[PDB]
């Protein structure tokens, strides 16, 4: 660690923080996207479909 | 700051210089440096003790 001048605690903490952020957000997204009871399909995303979804 | 170390030697100057009024540029002497790279090596050994009571 001292040879390759890597402060391991610091670098590991900030990379693990980034990982924790991404994984919590992925929990949120996975639960949000699992098993749509109500959805719209379209070939291409257009404002017609967004308006239809708000309606 | 232990890193792969590189010790260097300089060879002995073995040219004739200049005589009398001749100026140094008529015989410049060549400084020659030789090198070597020494990479570190990690090694160790350990001893495990018994229970404190023993």
């Amino acid at each position: 660690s001292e040879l390759e001048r890597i402060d391991f605690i610091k670098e590991s903490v900030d990379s693990l923080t980034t990982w924790m952020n991404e994984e919590r957000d992925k929990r949120i997204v996975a639960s949000l996207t699992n098993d749509f009871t109500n959805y719209l399909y379209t070939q291409t995303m257009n404002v017609a479909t967004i308006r239809k979804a708000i309606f | 700051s232990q890193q792969p170390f590189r010790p260097r030697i300089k060879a002995q100057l073995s040219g004739s210089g200049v005589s009398g009024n001749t100026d140094f540029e008529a015989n410049y002497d060549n400084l020659e440096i030789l090198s070597q790279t020494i990479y570190p090596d990690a090694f160790g050994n350990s001893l495990r003790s018994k229970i404190k009571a023993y």
């Binding site: 693990l16 923080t17 949120i28 | -």
Partner: protein, 54 residues
């Protein structure tokens, strides 16, 4: 929460860890009795938007 142990391999190595306890669910409420309503097994506030990738 962070857990830092500098005592791995007799103190020669170090372990950093990060942990979280979180309940995450899509809001989807079930009937607390046997009555079936429009809210029974539905995403309470989610509509999907599916399209093709490029």
């Amino acid at each position: 929460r962070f857990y830092i142990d500098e005592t791995v391999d007799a103190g020669r190595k170090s372990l950093v860890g990060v942990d979280c306890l979180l309940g995450v669910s899509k809001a989807r409420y079930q009937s607390t009795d046997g009555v079936v309503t429009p809210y029974d097994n539905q995403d309470y506030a989610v509509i999907g938007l599916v399209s093709d990738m490029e």
